[PDB]
RNA sequence: CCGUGAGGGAAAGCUGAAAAGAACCCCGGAAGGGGGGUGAAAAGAGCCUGAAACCGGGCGGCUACAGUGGGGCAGGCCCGAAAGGAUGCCCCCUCCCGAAGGAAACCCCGGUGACGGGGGAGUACGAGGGAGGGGGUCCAGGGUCUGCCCUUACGUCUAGAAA
RNA sequence: GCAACCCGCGAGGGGCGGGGUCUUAAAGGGCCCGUAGUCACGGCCGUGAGACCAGAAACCGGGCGAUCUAGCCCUGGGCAGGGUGAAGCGGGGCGAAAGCCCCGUGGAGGCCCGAAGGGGUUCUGAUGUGCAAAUCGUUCCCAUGACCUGGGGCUAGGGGCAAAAGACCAAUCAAGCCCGGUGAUAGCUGGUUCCCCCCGAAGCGGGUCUCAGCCCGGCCUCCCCGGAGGCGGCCGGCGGGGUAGAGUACUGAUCGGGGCCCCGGUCAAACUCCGAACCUGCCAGCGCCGUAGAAGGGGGGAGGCGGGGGCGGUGGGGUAAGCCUCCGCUCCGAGACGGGAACAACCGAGACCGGGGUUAAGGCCCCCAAGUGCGGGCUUAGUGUCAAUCUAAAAGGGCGUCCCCCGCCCAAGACAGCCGAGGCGGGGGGCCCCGAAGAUGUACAGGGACUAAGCCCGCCGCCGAGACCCCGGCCCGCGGGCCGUUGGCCCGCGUGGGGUAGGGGGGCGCGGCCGUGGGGCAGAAGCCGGGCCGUGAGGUCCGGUGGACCCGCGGCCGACGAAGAUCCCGGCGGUAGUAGCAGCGAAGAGGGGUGAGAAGCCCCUCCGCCGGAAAGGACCAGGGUUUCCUGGCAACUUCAAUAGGCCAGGAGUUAG
RNA sequence: CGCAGGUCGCAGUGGCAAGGGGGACCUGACUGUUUAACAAAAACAUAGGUCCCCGCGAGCCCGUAAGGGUGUGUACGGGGGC
RNA sequence: CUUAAGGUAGCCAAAUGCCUUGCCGGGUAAGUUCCGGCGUGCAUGAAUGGAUCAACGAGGUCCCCACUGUCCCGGCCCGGGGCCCGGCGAACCCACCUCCAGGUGCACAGUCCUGGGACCCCCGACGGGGCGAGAAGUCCCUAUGGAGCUUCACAGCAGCCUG
RNA sequence: GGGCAUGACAGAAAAGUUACCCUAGGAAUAACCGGCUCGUCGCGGGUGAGAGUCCCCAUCGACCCCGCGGUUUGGUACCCAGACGUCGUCUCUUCCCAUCCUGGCGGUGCAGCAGCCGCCAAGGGUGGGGCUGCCCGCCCAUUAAAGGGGAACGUGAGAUGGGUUCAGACCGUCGCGAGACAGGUCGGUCUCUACCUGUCGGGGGCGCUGGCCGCCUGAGGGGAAGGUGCCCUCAGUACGAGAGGAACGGGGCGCCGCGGCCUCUAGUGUACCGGUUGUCCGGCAGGGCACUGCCGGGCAGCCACGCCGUGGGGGAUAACCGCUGAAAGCAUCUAAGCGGGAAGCCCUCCCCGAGACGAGGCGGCCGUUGCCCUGGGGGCAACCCCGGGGCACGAGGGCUCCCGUAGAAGACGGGGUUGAUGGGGGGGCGGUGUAACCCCCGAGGGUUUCCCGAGGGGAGAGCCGGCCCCUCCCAAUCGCCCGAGCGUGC
């Protein structure tokens, strides 16, 4: 094998490293959470920028407990989501696949939805709800179809993004259906979904970097004593043994970035109502200003500075939950 | 024409009987193109005939869920004027003869049984060879494609070649 | 003589005898004798000649070369700047003398640093279908001298020249180049061109400066002579033999017992009292072949003189080998086809063409034609899945499980801890388990999968080749017959029909000639496509194109047939609208004019590069009109063009 | 060429231009020469040392020969080795 | 004693020591190299030159200081290639042209067997495979093949000496 | 007729050397790799003399014997001489298990701490240096441990080129000699524009049973996405005569790997600002060139030396440990049944994903139509059917346009007047460092103290932004296209 042991260069768990099929993250997994009341299990927001904050450490066993520590934070611009439709799911008896059985739309969808959808002038919502009720007894899951409101964000674009977010919180399917139907035509604000201090998972398409070489793409070494090597140094030496031929595990140049990634256990530090208190006087570089609600996340988030980011309840939460009390954010670097 | 030199050294034939060598009109910057002329024939000065490779266009067949070339059988689409048959070919029916070979239903005897034996029966049938009747329209041949079956480029030394 | 066959004569053939001659004292022996040659035409082969075609490195003859390079000679040119500081010469200081010390002056050196110039170290940099058949960048070495450089001159091939590397002597040097000897030779390598039909090998023995060659035999083929016997099989009569086994008796080896002997035991390629199977000699018979020609003999031509697989000789050797070296049958080579998953030589089996039928090996759950066929038993490990090539397994352990045999106990007081019926041990067999570990991809050995669709003992039917049977067609060998015949046709018979090298027999095509008969401007040859005929080489016809020659038949002759030779010459592709048109320290822009057309030609403005020069001034050799003017753009310039060292037309070089 | 004073920068040989230095061993004394096109060297040469053939009509070498080189020279010389 | 003598002065695990990374010191955290010693030295030694390094070195080597993108360990930037457009417009190579696995076979298959896959076409990149391309293998052997060189080979010819 | 001789004996008269080498050929024949073989090499098993205080088998294993692997070396000569690039290293990927650590279990001559031995197990780890051309090996400091093998001795059309193994040269030795040595030593060209395939990423189309939009599903595919240490407590406790000295559980944090991100810090930053050298533009100011002239600072962007995330569980199992339990009145983990049991396998988790041809589900939008020109046929009286073309209707889509969450080309995303998409203008925030003008100070000198003078101070900064906001002032225009519609059968 190798002359000297060392781990392989880069992961093959993200193979193939192709461009994401869609700029909007498509979430595969939604957790089962018992909150005691029905609620959406996720939210969507626009990444605005990064700052750093002075946060009091509230972990009693932590060596920094009670101290003020500086943490890098990510600001999300989070205008309310507009609920456009409710969809019901059952299980196909032939194979156990989850299958949509129907959906009910708001009668008068907003004009901006017409930029992406082929809609009638009016939906007859009552008939659709009536038809939906026939499938109540075979329902296993209920999701709402939400549209973003980018006009209320700092981006200012008009074309919205549309995605499904399930309703959870209680084990009873019927109450989830009743709660989802009550949301038809209404908006959902981040405070309706999350509470400050809780953990969330974040899913987004990462920043694009175009075609990149094998050194940057996989972390292969530049050939040591770089000047010695004819035909270049930013490369692998060989591209394989004699057999098997080029395998799919061989590092090769290609697209780097613009992939969908999921990161876990990011703490929500603050959910604000008015973004003027967090927007720097210069504005967020390459983004703009935040005028409505915002989410302050501890740490970094995948994606470029205008990407739509999906937050969900965690699917791998740690054994010990964070403290119930809201974290104490003393100061943020965008302030005086 | 090549080598300082001694020396070395190619390729390259054909308008038409006659120039009758293309007047004249339109277009083009021009080479030239279209129309219109000459001649038995463009044979048009890049000049007899004008093959193949090769490239363009048209036509026939195929073409994005199916692994390629060759052969046989069956079929689809297309061609099938002449030089081949059309007294053809194809289908049906009936009749006769028929090599090697050759059942079945059913009755009887045996075996646990797979099956064997006597009769039915050297029958029904059977390559092919003869005769007639009804119906149809091309048949042969060719291009290409599909299905099924078969199939390991050539030349060579070698004990041994798809190597 | 019915025939069978017997008898006589008996050319040719065979044997003797006789004769000529040589040798010898002679006998004996050698050669020769009772008839056929010679000349020609065609063919095959040998030897020479270039000798089927292509191919060396070489060697010799006579010439040509020192514009390159090596050396030397004659006559010209060049080397910024700086540093060090020899001999010699002054002054001062110390000092008793000698002398010593300091400072200066001076300007030596195959001295030092470093431009020009010369050289060529490193990056083992760039380039590596290059700018270039040796270059470029960078870093380097020398740079007043054994220094660098121009012109002229000398030394020439077995010779030169060499501060010597066998360097260099015109991109050529462990012996130049040109032409000639010369088509050098090659046991070696490559190539060697139409069809059908008949037969059909070999890699063995001997000799060889022989081992990649060749010759004489074996094996093939064709022809002729000859004339009745022959032998890959079997039975018998009469013989030969010394292997397997056996023995341990001769020659040897070797373990024990008993008193050099006796008894028991272990052995032998180079031991043998015995002794098979088996092979082999003669005779008789059988069987088959043979007068449609046995034995034997003569002549022509070979190929080949590298073999290989299976099985058998424990062959002999070797740890073993898809190993080396012998002996024998068969098969591949030179043999199609069915089965084996594939697969020259394992099994089956030998193929002219078409069709029908039946079997062989092997198979019958699906792939896949035919059985989810029949009875019994075993295995629980997916063990395994119908011989070999072919992908596997040992010593050993296991009552795991199925089974067989033996010994002992129990006569119901056995085994196990009164109860009541079987119990304990040994030996063996079947299947399976452990022993059992590998490298790209699944219980691999064809795949699916199967608890039988596995294994063992038996059984029934079916499928399945080109084999075997039958029908039709074709061809062949041999024999017979007919026909005025360098040939044609008919009949009969064949347990006739594969074939490389090679031998033998017949036909097709191409160019010409000698004859004969014809076609063609109402359309020859050629060319494109098509129909028909022939097993085939090929022939013939039709439609189109073309524009003047051509063909049938008989005979004769060749500069006579291509798919291939890193073949030759020409043309033309894919590659591909791809590489390159970057790198070496300059580059363009605006406006106007000309013009069919302008980023690029002409004019101005702006911007840049050289300036002890890849760039300004002069000029030798070499080049030879490239100079200048006018006009132009088919070609030429790595793009464009109205430009040009290009093209056309004209002109131009003045000397005491 | 020198002296005194003032003064700025991160940097005053400001760009350009322009030695890294020291210790030791092997080896050839040195400068020089070399495999044009894979070897620049410790190889060749070298000054110096030493030996040999030679008194010139010599020694050594070239030429078929006529003749020639060393030699317009002469042992403090010519030639030949190491 | 053996073909005469019998390695002297020196020098050394040497560019010369196989054994051998010899043994002991130095230097390193760690030293098969290097330096200093040691020496019956496989096989050192005197113009075949021995010992010997001042000066010199594009010679070969070890150590120290300084220094740094050599490295830890990679990042960003600049000019030209690159990529795209316009224009010009080749070559190498080429029997035909090839998805993967495990087999089989002249023993290392694109083409054979049994499997596993694949909608087709196009662009960029690379260099694992095509036993990739280049060059009738220089290695090695064979040939009753060469060339040049050597001498105690077989011969021969000059040159010199001698009658 | 006898003899004189060829012993290489079916009869030439015959020495070397080539690494300066050349030609013809040979896989008839060596060297590398491959094939066969496995003596050798490595690994496993049987046996049990003997050692182990007693005690064969905790640990060993004499004398012998049975095997496996293809990993050393050899044997052979089957393929390849019109050629498969010859050692090592670098880089990069994968596979094996006969397991060094990490997970599980057992034995011990296992008190504890350690150690030794066996079994399951290949998911992950197995590192940094010194010496030598190495490979191997020895050594140093660490470490959980610093395993071994295969892939044409993996990988030179990827590199490197130190050794080996060309031509030059030196030494020792051998040879009369030229020369030779697989003994040492110094020097000594690493060629190719990628045709096919593969791999990695990026596009166009056709299909999915009329066209389209949006949201989903999940067959299968990929994954190591995580691995592994340390400290405290337990506790100076258990154990132990002492010396010494654990563990489960609980708490905290790294190292290596993977995936993101740019707030901080660091790098860069030929946008930008300033200083300054030489020269040129007459001087000042401003500027060219010195290939950013050099130097300092530096926004955005990119980036690591920076920051963030990176888990437990469930199921069936392996080695095995047990329950009940007969065969076999007892006993027995096993024969039926049952319980427990690994970093391994599967799922959970992350990525790709309907070309998943059984081409899927859901909701919605659209089409399911007409007219014109022309050719043919039927009966001709309209008419109807068929061929070709054109136009209209029509959801949706594209080009053109302004751009950037994107980007080699394509693609993707945003905007397009019902509009803040780029620019301009104003404002915010930021870089540099304080322009011009004016006033004061200035070492000293002179037309004497109204001039020169490097420079210092004040007020004012000045220049600039590939960032944010606001504002229609300019430009997102004019336009060019694609598009289902119909039959037939099962
Ligand atoms: Mg290099
Ligand atoms: Mg013509
Ligand atoms: Mg016809
Ligand atoms: Mg007719
Ligand atoms: Mg051969
Ligand atoms: Mg062979
Ligand atoms: Mg062949
Ligand atoms: Mg001859
Ligand atoms: Mg000769
Ligand atoms: Mg001569
Ligand atoms: Mg000259
Ligand atoms: Mg000098
Ligand atoms: Mg070099
Ligand atoms: Mg180079
Ligand atoms: Mg190149
Ligand atoms: Mg100098
Ligand atoms: Mg030499
Ligand atoms: Mg010569
Ligand atoms: Mg010669
Ligand atoms: Mg010649
Ligand atoms: Mg025959
Ligand atoms: Mg041969
Ligand atoms: Mg007999
Ligand atoms: Mg015997
Ligand atoms: Mg015996
Ligand atoms: Mg015998
Ligand atoms: Mg032989
Ligand atoms: Mg044999
Ligand atoms: Mg042969
Ligand atoms: Mg077969
Ligand atoms: Mg069947
Ligand atoms: Mg055995
Ligand atoms: Mg098995
Ligand atoms: Mg025959
Ligand atoms: Mg004739
Ligand atoms: Mg041929
Ligand atoms: Mg040609
Ligand atoms: Mg071409
Ligand atoms: Mg290019
Ligand atoms: Mg310059
Ligand atoms: Mg230019
Ligand atoms: Mg200048
Ligand atoms: Mg100058
Ligand atoms: Mg000049
Ligand atoms: Mg001129
Ligand atoms: Mg002119
Ligand atoms: Mg001219
Ligand atoms: Mg400089
Ligand atoms: Mg020297
Ligand atoms: Mg050279
Ligand atoms: Mg050199
Ligand atoms: Mg010397
Ligand atoms: Mg001396
Ligand atoms: Mg001497
Ligand atoms: Mg001594
Ligand atoms: Mg010395
Ligand atoms: Mg010594
Ligand atoms: Mg040394
Ligand atoms: Mg000596
Ligand atoms: Mg010496
Ligand atoms: Mg000596
Ligand atoms: Mg000396
Ligand atoms: Mg020198
Ligand atoms: Mg182009
Ligand atoms: Mg095989
Ligand atoms: Mg191939
Ligand atoms: Mg490409
Ligand atoms: Mg050859
Ligand atoms: Mg050769
Ligand atoms: Mg010979
Ligand atoms: Mg002999
Ligand atoms: Mg190889
Ligand atoms: Mg070998
Ligand atoms: Mg062994
Ligand atoms: Mg034991
Ligand atoms: Mg081996
Ligand atoms: Mg061989
Ligand atoms: Mg081979
Ligand atoms: Mg080859
Ligand atoms: Mg290769
Ligand atoms: Mg090659
Ligand atoms: Mg194991
Ligand atoms: Mg290798
Ligand atoms: Mg290479
Ligand atoms: Mg390679
Ligand atoms: Mg080297
Ligand atoms: Mg070397
Ligand atoms: Mg060498
Ligand atoms: Mg000697
Ligand atoms: Mg390349
Ligand atoms: Mg998976
Ligand atoms: Mg990272
Ligand atoms: Mg900077
Ligand atoms: Mg100024
Ligand atoms: Mg200037
Ligand atoms: Mg500049």
UniProtKB/Swiss-Prot annotation:
GO biological process, alphabetically ordered: translation
Comp. bias regions, Basic residues: 227-236
Xref: Gene3D superfamilies: 3.30.1430.10, Ribosomal protein L3, domain 3, Translation factors
Record-linked Pfam families: Ribosomal_L3
Disulfide bond residue pairs: none
GO CC terms: cytosolic large ribosomal subunit
Region called Disordered, residue ranges: 227-254
Molecular function via GO: rRNA binding; structural constituent of ribosome
Domain of life: Archaea
UniProt cross-references to InterPro entries, sorted A to Z: L3_arc_euk, Ribosomal_L3_dom_3_arc_sf, Ribosomal_uL3, Ribosomal_uL3_arc, Ribosomal_uL3_CS, Transl_B-barrel_sf
Alphabetical keyword list: Ribonucleoprotein, Ribosomal protein, RNA-binding, rRNA-binding
NCBIfam families (alphabetical): L3_arch, PRK04231.1
Role according to the record: One of the primary rRNA binding proteins, it binds directly near the 3'-end of the 23S rRNA, where it nucleates assembly of the 50S subunit.
Similarity comment text for this entry: Belongs to the universal ribosomal protein uL3 family.
Quaternary structure and interacting proteins, as annotated: Part of the 50S ribosomal subunit. Forms a cluster with proteins L14 and L24e.
Record's protein name: Large ribosomal subunit protein uL3
Gene responsible for this protein: rpl3
């Amino acid at each position: 094998g190798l002359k000297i042991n060392r781990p392989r260069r880069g992961s093959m768990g993200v193979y193939p490293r192709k461009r994401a099929a869609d700029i909007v993250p498509r979430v595969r997994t939604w957790p089962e959470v018992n909150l005691g009341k029905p609620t959406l299990l996720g939210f969507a927001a626009y990444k605005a920028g990064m700052l750093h904050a002075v946060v009091v450490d509230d972990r009693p066993t932590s060596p920094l407990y009670g101290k003020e520590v500086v943490k890098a934070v990510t600001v999300l611009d989070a205008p309310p989501l507009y609920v456009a439709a409710v969809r019901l799911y059952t299980l196909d008896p032939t194979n156990g696949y989850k299958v949509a059985v129907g959906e009910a739309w708001v009668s008068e969808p907003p004009a901006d939805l017409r930029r992406v959808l082929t809609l009638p002038e009016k939906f007859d919502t009552e008939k659709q709800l009536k038809a939906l009720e026939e499938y109540r007894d075979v329902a296993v899951d209920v999701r709402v179809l939400v549209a973003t409101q980018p006009r209320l964000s700092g981006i200012g674009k008009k074309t919205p993004e549309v995605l499904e977010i399930p309703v959870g919180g209680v084990p009873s399917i019927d109450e989830r259906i009743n709660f989802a139907i009550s949301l038809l035509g209404k908006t959902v604000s981040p405070k309706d979904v999350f509470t400050p201090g809780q953990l969330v998972d974040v899913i987004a398409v990462t920043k694009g970097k175009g075609y990149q070489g094998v050194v940057k793409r996989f972390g292969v070494t530049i050939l040591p004593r770089w000047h010695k090597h004819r035909k270049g140094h930013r490369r692998t030496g060989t591209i394989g043994p004699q057999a098997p031929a080029l395998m799919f595990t061989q590092p090769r140049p290609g697209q780097m970035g613009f992939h969908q990634r999921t990161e876990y256990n990011k703490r929500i530090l603050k959910i604000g109502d008015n973004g003027a208190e967090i927007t720097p006087k210069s504005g967020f570089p390459h983004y703009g200003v935040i005028k409505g609600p915002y989410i302050l996340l501890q740490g970094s988030v995948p994606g470029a500075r205008k990407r739509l980011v999906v937050l969900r309840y965690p699917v791998r939460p740690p054994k010990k939950a964070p403290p119930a009390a809201e974290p104490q954010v003393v100061w943020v670097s965008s302030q005086s």
